[PDB]
Amino acid sequence: TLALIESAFFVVILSALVASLTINVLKHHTFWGLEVWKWCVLVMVIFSGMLVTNWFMRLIVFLIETNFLLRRKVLYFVHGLK
């Protein structure tokens, strides 16, 4: 629910950033001494970075599961510090 809304917002921000990069019309507008596309890309960076951190944590957990090492202490440390 709430997580899905955040993911959708991050996807929308990424799409807007891609459109701004592809279309120079938005670049003509600037605010706070910086281009509007810069701020949009920054916000999309924050959101997509949260999403990428979650995805990378999941991928690291999966790789550790498939990894040959199976030390109990290492698994507990990873679970605690994820």
Curated annotation (Swiss-Prot):
Mechanosensitive channel that opens in response to stretch forces in the membrane lipid bilayer. Disulfide bonds: none annotated. Belongs to the MscS (TC 1.A.23) family. This is Mechanosensitive ion channel protein 10. It is found in: Cell membrane. The gene is MSL10. The chain crosses the membrane at residues 1-19, 31-51. Detected in the root tip and throughout the vasculature of the root and leaf.
